[PDB]
Each structure stands twice: as C-alpha cells, then as structure tokens.
Amino acid sequence: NPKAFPLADAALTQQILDVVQQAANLRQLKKGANEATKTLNRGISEFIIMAADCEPIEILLHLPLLCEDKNVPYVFVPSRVALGRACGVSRPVIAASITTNDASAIKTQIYAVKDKIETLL
Amino acid sequence: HIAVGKQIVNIPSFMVRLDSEKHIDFAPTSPFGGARPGRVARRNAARKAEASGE
Amino acid sequence: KNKGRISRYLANKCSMASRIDNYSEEPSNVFGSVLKKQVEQRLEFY
Amino acid sequence: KISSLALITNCVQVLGVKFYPKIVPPSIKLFDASLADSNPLKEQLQVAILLLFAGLIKRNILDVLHVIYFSSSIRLSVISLIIENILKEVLKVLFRIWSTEIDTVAVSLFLSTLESTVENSATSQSPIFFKLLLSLFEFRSISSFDNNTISRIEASVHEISNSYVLKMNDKVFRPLF
Amino acid sequence: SDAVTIRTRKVISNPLLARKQFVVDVLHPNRANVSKDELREKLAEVYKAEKDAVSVFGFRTQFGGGK
Amino acid sequence: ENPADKRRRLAKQYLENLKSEANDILTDIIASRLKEDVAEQQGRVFRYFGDKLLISEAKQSFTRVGENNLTCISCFQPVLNKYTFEESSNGDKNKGRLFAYTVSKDLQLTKYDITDFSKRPKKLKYAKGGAKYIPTSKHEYENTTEGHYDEILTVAASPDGKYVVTGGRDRKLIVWSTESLSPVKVIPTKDRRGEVLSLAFRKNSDQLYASCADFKIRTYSINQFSQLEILYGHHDIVEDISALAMERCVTVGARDRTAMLWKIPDETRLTFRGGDEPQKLLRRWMKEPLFFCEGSIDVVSMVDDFHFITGSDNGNICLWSLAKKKPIFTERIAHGILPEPSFNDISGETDEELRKRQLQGKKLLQPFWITSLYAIPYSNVFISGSWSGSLKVWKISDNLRSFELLGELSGAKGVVTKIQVVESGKHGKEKFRILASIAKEHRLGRWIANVSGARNGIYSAVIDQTG
RNA sequence: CAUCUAUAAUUUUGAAUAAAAAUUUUGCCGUUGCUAUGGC
C-alpha cells in the first residue's frame, strides 16, 4: 500500500526504536496520535514515528498532512506493538512524536535518525 | 549524591565516557536513591514526633 | 459528571471516524457500526 | 408454652420498668420450669429465662448461675452483666458450682467466670480459691476429656492463679503456700 | 540487610615460608570498616586453620565505603 | 556411634543399592554411576538423553486456573545428597513430594502438588496479596508490608525446600515459608524504579540472584535474609537471569541486546553481543527470504557452565559459548511468522483489492517472540515457547556446536510465560514432566491480548524415554 | 519440625442406623459424556 509510503527497513527501524526509547527515558517523547498532533500544531516536534498496521490506517494517516505541511520528518514502522515496547508503556502505541530540546543528551542520535529519515523522504 | 556505575564521584570535572554516561545514577547511600533520609529530615521528624508526644 | 465522561469519549470516537471517512475513498459502514457499538457498550456500562 | 413465654416476657418488662417475697417465688417457679425443660420453642424459652435473669441481676445466686451454665454468646454477655453488677459471695458460688459440676461449654463458661472475677479482700477470698485449684487438679486426674482440652483448661487456670497470687500480698498466704 | 562478604583473589601458595598469601576483598555495605579480629576469625573458619595462624594487614577502604 | 562410622554405614548401603540396581539392569557400570554422581559439579553436559525421548507419545494435559494471567512458575524437586545421604526435602512427611508454585498478576501465589505424573496438579495452598498492604509512608526506603500490592512477577523455590521467594512491581521481595505460605521476611529493593524482573537460585544453594529493572542485579543470601551485593553493567532493564551450580550467573539486558555473564567471586563480567546483518544474510542466501533484525534479547538459560542459549524477540534462538564473543550458532525464526492482519480490518474501505494492497504483502509480517526458554541443567535438550500455541523441544548436537528441532507439543495455547521441568523414576528410566505457565498476556506489559483461545492455566506434558 | 488432635479410611458389635476398639481441573457464563473443551 503506498498510503503509508515511507516504511523503514529493519536497520532503520532498529535505530528509530532505539532513539524512541532513549527519548522516552529522558522524557522528550509524546505518545499517541492526539498528543502527536498537538506537538505538531505547536511546532515542537523533531519528528514523527507511526505504526503501519493500524486498524484501519487512516486514523493516524491524517498526520502526514500536517507533517509535510510544516516540514517535519515522518516515518512508518512495521508493528504498533513493537512501537509500544519501544515507547515503554503497557499498551500498543500507533504514533509517537520525538519533541525538540536543545538541552538533551540524545541530541546526536535524534539528528542521525532525522537525517536518514529526510534522505528516505 | 551521584555515583557513576558503582563508585561515588564528587568531582564536577569528571569527563564521563560513553558507557559511563549511560550508567550515572544516584548513589546507594543517598537520601535520594537509597538509605534513610538526611539529618535535617530526621531532625524535623524527631521534633514533630516529640511535639506530638507532648 | 458522567455526562462529561460520555461527551468526551464520543468526541474521541467522532474524530477517529472523521479521519477514516476523509482519507478513505469509499468508507465502510463496518467501521462505523463497530465504533458505534463501542460507544454503546460504554454507555451501557454507565 | 407460648402462654408461658408471654408471661415470662411480661414479667421481664414489668420488672425492667420496676417485693422480694413475690420476686423470689417466680424465681423458684422458673428454676422448676428450667429443670423440667432440661423443641425450638424450648430453646427460645431458655432464652427467655436467660433474659429475665439478666433483668433481675441488673436490678439463690448459686442456682441462678447453675441454670445459666446448664441452660452461648448470649450466655457470655449475661455473665459479663453478672460480673459488672455484683464478690466473696461470688467466690463461694464459684466453688459450690464447681463441686456440683464435677460439659465443654459449661466448663468454658466456668473458666470465663474465673478469669473475669480475678481480673475484677484477696486475703479473705484466698482459701476457698486454693481449695478450688485443688479441685481442678483433681478434675484433671478424673476427667473424661482429651489431652489437648485438659491442657487448655490447665493453662487457663495457671494464668488466672498467677494473676490472683500476684494481686495478693505475700505474708498473708505464706501459710497457704 | 547487613551481610559482610569475605572473598580472596590472587592466591599464591608460598611453601618456602610455609604459607598461602592472597589478597582479601571485604564487602561491607551500610557498615564501616570490618575489624581485623573478625576478619581473622572468618578467614580461619574458611581456610580451616587457626586464628593464631591467620594474619592480615594493610586494609584500605575505597572512596564511598562498602568495600 | 561415631560420625565417621555412620557415614561409612550410609555409604555401604548406597553401594548395596547400586549393586542391586546394576544386577537389575543386567537382567564398569558401578564405576560409571559413581563417576556421574560426581560429574554434576564439573560443568560439562553429561546428561545425554537427547534422543531417547519419545515426543510423539508425550501425554499432554491442560489444567485451567482461576486467577487471570499467571505470570510465572517455579518447580521444586527433592534430590538425594552425595556428601551426606539424607535427602533434599526438609521435613519427613515429604519424602519426595514434587511441588510447584505459580504467581499471577492478580497478585496470587499458588502451590500445587505434582508428585504423581498421571494426575492433575492439585492445588494445595495459596496466598493473595491486595491493596491492604499499601505502605503508609509510600515514599521511603521502608516498603516492608507483609504482602504484595502490585503485579507479582517472578517466583523461585529454594533448593532446600524451606522457602519460596516472590517479587514483582511493588519493588519488594518476599520470602515465604513453604508450608503455611507464611511471609517470613520482606526485603525492599530500595530503588524508585527497582522492580524485580527475574529470580534464580544458584543450584543446591541459598544465594538468590534477582534481576531488577533499575539496570541492576541484586544478590541475596536467603538462609541469612540479607543482600550481599549489587552488580552493575547493563544499559536497559535487566530482563532475565539464570544461574547454575557454579558461582556464576547469566543475564540478558533487553534493548542493548546484550547477554552478560557474571563471575561473582572474581568480580568480573563477559559481554556477548549478537550482530547479524540482514543485508549480509541476503548476500549469503544469494550465494547459496525475510531477515528481521534483532529487536531486543528477552530470555536466557545456561545449558552448562560454559554454554548458554538466548532467545530474542525476533524469533532468534542463539547458542553462545564462553569462548567466542559472537554466538556460535544462531537459529532463525523459531516459531514462525505472526499471522497476517485481515485486509478489511487493515483498510477500512470496501474495495477488496485496495484492502489487499493495504495488507502490503510481506512487508508487514513479524516474527513470533521467544517468550520462554529453558534448558534442563547440564543436559542436551531445551524447550522453547512463544504464543504460537506449541512448545518446541530441541536437541543440541554432541559436539555442542549446533542444535536441531527434536519435536513439538501442541497442547499449549496462549502466551507461554514460563517453562519448568521435573524428573522422576530410576536412573535408567526417567520420566520428564514439562510444566508451562500459560496465560493470555505477556508477563511484563499488555501489548497483546488477541490470541485465539488462550486460557489461563498450567500445561503439563509427561514424556517417557525408551531405548 | 516432632508430637498430640481433627477429617477420612478399615477392625469388632449390631440386618442397618448406632457403638467404640485398634490401625493409616474454574472467578463468571457454555458445550460434554462416562473426562475434554468454548467465551468473558
């Protein structure tokens, strides 16, 4: 399906999920479609991760509009349950937003993943 | 209050390495990450328990 | 109070339905019906 | 039967609202009734006897306690009423009723009475009390019970005896020891 | 709670001076500074020798305590 | 009358028994039996029944359990000592009464008897935590209320049979006396995020290793009720632990995909990293399908003192040896690919071809997680389990360089939280009960509940061997 | 833990009740027979 167009391969998924857990730990990550849209509106998002097997896909498919409107990288990953593990919560998550903060330890990681996402876009 | 790995460090210039910056935490002796609260807290507690007794 | 609870739950399900119907070429009474049943079951719980 | 219960409870109410030469003859008639009884009508009867005993003790103590013993939680409650209202005479009552006694529930109520009395002078009460312990040990010797049961009574009596000897002053019961 | 550990490393059996010479690590958390007498008692228990045969010396407590 | 004479008497009785059983076998051998009974502490696999097993005729039996989402299980099995000769069990009623303990998210501890390998595990006793044990300070080191109030997560039964010790999300750790299930001692982990994630006893000993999710590994001595040590070194939650007769343990830290082996007395650790590359795999297959890349390492068990097996969350089972840093033999998707989501439900649009395009073919397939893994100590068989509703029994080669699928068992259904094994019979004829705590959800978080027909229970499979 | 006790097993008396020795698979719902399996 080309609706979830940029879908990460195994390696890029690894690094994406790793930086997602890092940001969840330093608490630079907003979890959920609604809060992600909120960060997107406020323009505080470094980039967006989405699930690719949502039931159905449109409920989060709304996001790429705002993403590529405001020039914020976005990427799909295979499994929402994997994304939930990566975030560190008890329930499957479908879309999360890595926010932006200059005083972060994971700066260089987020920038590497965002680099590769942009290349893939 | 902050021990790297297992070893309390009290030098602010310490130049953590990579894995060390993963391992920083509160020391197992701190009132913050461990044992009984500090002197001010337990002095206040003694004061309040005594004043309740009287 | 449960008026506010149910109102907000309905708002969430409504937004999801709007997403589906906007980005689906020919939407499906199947998802409409199941989401309505979900809200109905919550209301029955109340 | 039901007529008797009605008479009983009417006596209960009238005495609670409220002479001796016409309050003891009903007591006598009531011991007669209790021994004659000693079926759910009979149980609720015995309850009525217990209730009127509670009222009269509130406002022959020996056979009163006899009927109380040989008549559960209600029984313990009325015992607590007995100890709160009414003590040397109570001690003689205890000794005589034990002699009459020598089953499980009666013995348990007996031990409860002893513990209540002792937690509730002592020189006067001492000798019959020690004779009572003598009798309880003889009961251990001749009782138709089980080892665990008899040991339960044994520990209880040792505790109460320790309490009473602690209460009493020493030089007075030296010869008693 | 408080469980002192005595463990040995670098055991070199030196039969010239008729002994075993080793390096002792004592893990004392939430405690200060285990005694040499207790060290000798427990070392004798472990090594099945006599507290008169065991000897230790030179104990330095690491920064932050517990070892 | 003398201790030495007593020991001689017991030993000669042992020899009488050995000679009688040797004659029975007949209807070298004695030296061999003695040497094996020695051979336990030298940590080379010696127990080689890898192919005498009769998997196809293993008798399978589910047993439902009341509470929901059993989290974990621990089995206690009395042995006979070889220094002395009394027994492993504590009292005298027991005399070889096989026990099991199950802990459930519903905050329940449940001990069963499984002595008879033909009847269902009988529920002897239980103890339930609950909300009434919530600490009144709630904000200090002391956390010492005599019960659990959140998500008991692991259990371990002491090899001497006196205590069983449980720990979970409440950041406590409670040792119970087995008979009355009574809580005898409570030890806090004293860390805000120090949740206990796994428990393992050093075999035949009273040193307990608790892998805790504050990135640490605590180590307690139980016959003294104290915390000996903390071991540091992981980067993510130290998700699972396993220990054997030596003074070592092995752990898997999850996200760093890192298995670390802890030699305690030396105070040293050895780091094992995986490192398959899917594109290399593709090139190699061209020289010769789907190659998922390793997400996290989930479960671990030592087969031996020098070899251990780690099941990850991308279908991989790796066999590692202490010599080489890379795994010596990795094995691909163990329990197959997770079934495809339905087209209608992925799409939300009635056009059938559009829905199929939504399903996207292969690119949304994922592998089953290895949720449980267990190697019978010092033996050459190990049991792997996922939520594919089938335990897989595997046998390692004799050279300890590879392993193959010995067989399957399809009686399970659900998420296999934990696997355990119990032996019985004579030294020549050994019956093997395989217990599995099965529930609907993975024990750490929810993440998953849609499984066809999962039921909370204990899955017991009795295996007999002939040859 | 040991012991005692309790429950439950036999012995004896009595057709038997009775008497004593003395001894030693589920939380909720469903399908399914003489155990197995559904759903919440």
UniProtKB/Swiss-Prot annotation, chain B:
Glycyl lysine isopeptide (Lys-Gly) (interchain with G-Cter in ubiquitin) cross-link, renumbered residues: 48
Name of the molecule in the record: Small ribosomal subunit protein uS4A
Domain of life: Eukaryota
MF terms in GO: rRNA binding; structural constituent of ribosome
Alphabetical keyword list: Cytoplasm, Isopeptide bond, Nucleus, Phosphoprotein, Ribonucleoprotein, Ribosomal protein, Ribosome biogenesis, RNA-binding, rRNA processing, rRNA-binding, Ubl conjugation
Region described as Disordered: 28-54
Biological role: Component of the ribosome, a large ribonucleoprotein complex responsible for the synthesis of proteins in the cell. The small ribosomal subunit (SSU) binds messenger RNAs (mRNAs) and translates the encoded message by selecting cognate aminoacyl-transfer RNA (tRNA) molecules. The large subunit (LSU) contains the ribosomal catalytic site termed the peptidyl transferase center (PTC), which catalyzes the formation of peptide bonds, thereby polymerizing the amino acids delivered by tRNAs into a polypeptide chain.
Modified residues (Phosphoserine): 52
From-to range in the entire protein, with total length: 133 to 186 of 197
Annotated compartments: Cytoplasm; Nucleus, Nucleolus
Domain S4 RNA-binding: 1-49
Miscellaneous section: Present with 106000 molecules/cell in log phase SD medium.
GO cellular component terms given for this protein: 90S preribosome; cytoplasm; cytosol; cytosolic small ribosomal subunit; nucleolus; nucleoplasm; small-subunit processome
GO biological process, one term: translation
Family per record: Belongs to the universal ribosomal protein uS4 family.
UniProtKB/Swiss-Prot annotation, chain D:
Location in or out of the cell: Nucleus, Nucleolus; Mitochondrion
Note: Present with 18200 molecules/cell in log phase SD medium.
Summary of subunit composition and partner proteins: Interacts with snoRNA U3. Interacts with MPP10. Component of the ribosomal small subunit (SSU) processome composed of at least 40 protein subunits and snoRNA U3. In the absence of snoRNA3, forms a complex with other t-UTPs. This complex can associate with pre-18S ribosomal RNAs.
Function description: Involved in nucleolar processing of pre-18S ribosomal RNA. Required for optimal pre-ribosomal RNA transcription by RNA polymerase I together with a subset of U3 proteins required for transcription (t-UTPs). Involved in ribosome biosynthesis.
Family: Belongs to the HEATR1/UTP10 family.
Entry protein name: U3 small nucleolar RNA-associated protein 10
Organism taxonomic ancestry: Eukaryota, Fungi, Dikarya, Ascomycota, Saccharomycotina
Section covered of the full-length record: 1348 to 1548 of 1769
Swiss-Prot record, chain E:
This protein's record includes keyword Ribosomal protein: yes
Residues with Phosphoserine modification: 13, 55
GO cellular component: cytosol; cytosolic small ribosomal subunit; mitochondrion
Modified residues (N-acetylserine): 1
Cross-linked residues, Glycyl lysine isopeptide (Lys-Gly) (interchain with G-Cter in ubiquitin): 20
Maturation and modification: N-terminally acetylated by acetyltransferase NatA. Also partially acetylated by NatC.
Intracellular or extracellular location(s): Cytoplasm
The keyword Nuclease belongs to this UniProt entry's keyword annotation: no
MF terms in GO: structural constituent of ribosome
One example of a Gene Ontology biological process annotation: cytoplasmic translation
Alphabetically ordered keywords of this record: Acetylation, Cytoplasm, Isopeptide bond, Phosphoprotein, Ribonucleoprotein, Ribosomal protein, Ubl conjugation
Purpose of the protein: Component of the ribosome, a large ribonucleoprotein complex responsible for the synthesis of proteins in the cell. The small ribosomal subunit (SSU) binds messenger RNAs (mRNAs) and translates the encoded message by selecting cognate aminoacyl-transfer RNA (tRNA) molecules. The large subunit (LSU) contains the ribosomal catalytic site termed the peptidyl transferase center (PTC), which catalyzes the formation of peptide bonds, thereby polymerizing the amino acids delivered by tRNAs into a polypeptide chain.
Subunit organization: Component of the small ribosomal subunit (SSU). Mature yeast ribosomes consist of a small (40S) and a large (60S) subunit. The 40S small subunit contains 1 molecule of ribosomal RNA (18S rRNA) and 33 different proteins (encoded by 57 genes). The large 60S subunit contains 3 rRNA molecules (25S, 5.8S and 5S rRNA) and 46 different proteins (encoded by 81 genes).
Miscellaneous field: There are 2 genes for eS24 in yeast.
Originating gene: RPS24A
From Swiss-Prot, chain F:
Listed GO biological process terms: endonucleolytic cleavage in 5'-ETS of tricistronic rRNA transcript (SSU-rRNA, 5.8S rRNA, LSU-rRNA); endonucleolytic cleavage in ITS1 to separate SSU-rRNA from 5.8S rRNA and LSU-rRNA from tricistronic rRNA transcript (SSU-rRNA, 5.8S rRNA, LSU-rRNA); endonucleolytic cleavage to generate mature 5'-end of SSU-rRNA from (SSU-rRNA, 5.8S rRNA, LSU-rRNA); maturation of SSU-rRNA
Repeat positions for WD: 147-186, 191-230, 233-272, 292-330, 366-404, 411-457
Main location class: nucleus
SUPFAM superfamilies: WD40 repeat-like
A Pfam family this chain is assigned to: WD40
Record GO terms (molecular function): snoRNA binding; U3 snoRNA binding
Signal peptide: none
Entries under InterPro entries matching the protein: Rrp9-like, WD40/YVTN_repeat-like_dom_sf, WD40_repeat_dom_sf, WD40_rpt
Compartment list: Nucleus, Nucleolus
Keyword annotations of the record: Acetylation, Coiled coil, Nucleus, Phosphoprotein, Repeat, Ribonucleoprotein, Ribosome biogenesis, rRNA processing, WD repeat
Family that this chain belongs to: Belongs to the WD repeat RRP9 family.
Function recorded in the entry: Involved in nucleolar processing of pre-18S ribosomal RNA. Required for efficient pre-rRNA cleavage at sites A0, A1 and A2, and biosynthesis of 18S rRNA.
Protein name (record): Ribosomal RNA-processing protein 9
UniProt lineage: Eukaryota, Fungi, Dikarya, Ascomycota, Saccharomycotina
